[PDB]
């Protein structure tokens, strides 16, 4: 009632009515450089690194394969005990790689080892529902969400969950850290985006602008904004510095829901993957779809952009991941 | 390519060789999705299969490997992970014949068999399981026979008027579950009665999955 009663009177103008004077971004033409083949099952999640070369991808065949994007040469083949993996993350330095399977165990694998095989660093079996997303704050602490409408901050050295974020009503489906890995926003199925903190312990502000199940989420490189991808064919980029909604990107041309949200280095091109076998590129400032990323046989599931904005990776269910530039 | 990328592409070919081999042993084996209708589903078929989170059982029978995946009772909604099991060989949907006159420990908003008919229909309307076949298994054979002698059998279905015999009741409830799915030309429903013999239940499973892998091979060549 009185929560957002005064938040409407302070909004006389919108973000779209201001960015109509700056240089509009034309049609963005992105050509598929190389398609990351070798997979035999549908891809669900991926993650990039700081070097913009290595990347990890999760596949349903029980193999967490890691390779470099510049040469498309498979480096390591990690046999997964739980073939039904739905999420995976990559370390900022490239030491440990975790993946969330259906066995509710975040099996963390150590790459840089004295042996040749990729051994298991730790196992996080504290969750009760399906592991939906995981993100690496550093090589010791990790924030992993699950299908138990809660998030948890696990520690590799400790082995147990430090803080269990229990503030969501719907099923958690996404996670997105900050450029300094201090705060992070999570979007659940209750159309709620909560900004969970580490120093305070848990969320400090929520956003309920959406109308359906939120699938994926990202984070703006600035640190004050973030976009959310729901299932009702619309994305609402909320504001962390004004606990409101800046603008929305909805269109009746598309009918499927959003499955992946990503941001570039400058944050201009809003990479948003959909279930229409293609991916869209939003202006994120004026709500204009510049270009569309087509070429995938099945619907895309994962979408990540390098930290320097060099390459853009799109993964679909056809066991083929494409690299864009 | 100076003594490093030449070995890098060679290691990738060795990995691709293992990945190609990994897909062969994964395609010849049988995958089974065991999704029950109550709190504890598939209480009988998992006793003979030689072994938080899902439970998967790996066992070889008649020179054929089987993988039965059971999710149990989870608080997460099925809509967010029902597309992960797309491409499974067979689906086992165990339903008990003692759900028409029994109510689960809940708010009693709907009957057990009414919720079982809606749960079985919810799987068929999903756009991912329009091709996979669901194998129905009727539990509590003799227990349902004793219930017939002291029940009108028309609790869930009042419009039904038939014989009060296990031979006719099992045949009527089989057609009632076969009329719930709207895709009858794409999906083939297998109905069987779970027996305590400990070898006849998996024999029908082996014969059912053989009828499915023979259709996938015919679909592979294009004769389907």
């Amino acid at each position, epitope marked *: 009632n009185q929560i957002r009663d005064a938040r409407k009177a302070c909004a006389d103008a919108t973000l779209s009515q201001i960015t109509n004077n700056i240089d509009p971004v034309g049609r963005i033409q992105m050509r598929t450089r190389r398609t990351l083949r070798g997979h035999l099952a549908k891809i669900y999640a991926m993650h990039w690194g700081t070097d913009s070369r*290595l990347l990890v991808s999760a596949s349903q065949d029980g193999k967490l394969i890691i390779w470099d994007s510049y040469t498309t040469n498979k*480096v390591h083949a990690i046999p997964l005990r739980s073939s039904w993996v739905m999420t995976c993350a990559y370390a900022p330095s*490239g030491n440990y790689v975790a993946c969330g399977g259906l066995d509710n165990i975040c099996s963390i694998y150590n790459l*840089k080892t004295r*042996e040749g095989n990729v051994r298991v660093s730790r196992e996080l079996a504290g969750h009760t529902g399906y592991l939906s997303c995981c993100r690496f704050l550093d090589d010791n602490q990790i924030v992993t969400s699950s299908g138990d409408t809660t998030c948890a901050l696990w520690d590799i050295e400790t082995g147990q969950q430090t803080t269990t974020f229990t503030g969501h009503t719907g099923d958690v489906m996404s996670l997105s850290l900050a450029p300094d890995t201090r705060l992070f926003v999570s979007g659940a199925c209750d159309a709620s985006a909560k900004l969970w903190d580490v120093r305070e312990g848990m969320c400090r502000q929520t956003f309920t602008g959406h109308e359906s199940d939120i699938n994926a989420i990202c984070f703006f490189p600035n640190g004050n904004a973030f976009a959310t991808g729901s299932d009702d064919a619309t994305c609402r980029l909320f504001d962390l510095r004004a606990d409101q909604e800046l603008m929305t990107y909805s269109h009746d041309n598309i009918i499927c829901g959003i499955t992946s949200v990503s941001f570039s280095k400058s944050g201009r091109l809003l990479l948003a993957g959909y279930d229409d076998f293609n991916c869209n590129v939003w202006d994120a400032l004026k709500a204009d779809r510049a270009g569309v990323l087509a070429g995938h046989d099945n619907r895309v599931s994962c979408l990540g952009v390098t930290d320097d904005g060099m390459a853009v990776a799109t993964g679909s269910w056809d066991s083929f991941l494409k690299i864009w530039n | 390519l100076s*003594a490093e990328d*030449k070995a890098a592409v060679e*290691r990738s070919k*060795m990995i691709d060789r293992n990945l190609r081999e990994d897909g062969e042993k994964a395609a010849r084996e049988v995958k089974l999705l065991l999704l029950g209708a109550g709190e504890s589903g598939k209480c009988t078929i998992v006793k003979q299969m030689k072994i938080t989170g899902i439970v998967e059982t790996h066992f070889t029978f008649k020179d054929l490997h089987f993988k039965m995946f059971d999710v149990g009772a989870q608080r997460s909604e099925r809509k967010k992970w029902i597309h992960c099991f797309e491409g499974v060989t067979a689906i086992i949907f165990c339903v008990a014949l003692s759900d028409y006159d029994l109510v689960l420990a809940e708010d009693e908003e709907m009957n057990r068999m009414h919720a079982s008919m809606k749960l079985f229909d919810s799987i068929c309307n999903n756009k991912w399981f329009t091709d996979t076949s669901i194998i129905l298994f009727l539990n509590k054979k003799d227990l349902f026979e004793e219930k017939i002698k002291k029940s009108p059998l028309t609790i869930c279905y009042p419009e039904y008027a038939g014989s009060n015999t296990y031979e006719e009741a099992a045949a009527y409830i089989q057609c009632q579950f076969e009329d719930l799915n709207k895709r009858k030309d794409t999906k083939e429903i297998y109905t069987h009665f779970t027996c305590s013999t400990d070898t006849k239940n998996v024999q029908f499973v082996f014969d059912a999955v053989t009828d499915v892998i023979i259709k996938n091979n015919l679909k592979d060549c294009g004769l389907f």
Partner: single-chain antibody
Amino acid sequence: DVQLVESGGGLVQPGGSRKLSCSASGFAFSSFGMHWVRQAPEKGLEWVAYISSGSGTIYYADTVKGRFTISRDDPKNTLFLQMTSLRSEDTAMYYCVRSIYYYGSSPFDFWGQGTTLTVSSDIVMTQATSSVPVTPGESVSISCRSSKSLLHSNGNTYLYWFLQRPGQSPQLLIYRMSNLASGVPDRFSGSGSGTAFTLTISRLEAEDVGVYYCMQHLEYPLTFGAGTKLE
């Protein structure tokens, strides 16, 4: 238990062979690819043979091509070395490097203990110095020269530095001329522009002395440096 053991006879007569057998332990086999490097007395290192993972790529040196037959038994985790005829030139201490090649790897990581043997085009890695007598404690610079510029088109220069403690096997100090090895302190710093290849040991503790080597990884056969001993 990552150490490697080698087997070899005391001395062999011309006209036969010893069938040098090397075994592995600890690390996951069938994924690295063993090397063959012999060290003649009062001489420098020299590559002999190398087999890849799975007997795919088999390379021989210009000095042993046609006489030595490198073999292995991966199900046994054992490496063999068949020879046709032994000569007085082959009298050296054969080593196994146990290297692996991928992006972000540490090639030439852990050399084996090595066995002894006694019998009764190519990048010429030259060094400006051979023995630098300097007091330990702080920064000491060591350079290395190459015949061809090791800077490749991708942007990675393949150079590896070895220490070879007196009485032991050489160990990796800095790979790619700029990245520190796994298991070495933060004292080793490597710089250079294609051919300079300067190595600054800013700490130079007591155990840092030994015969150093700089080897290229662009042309086969692989040639090692002349040797730089520190006191």
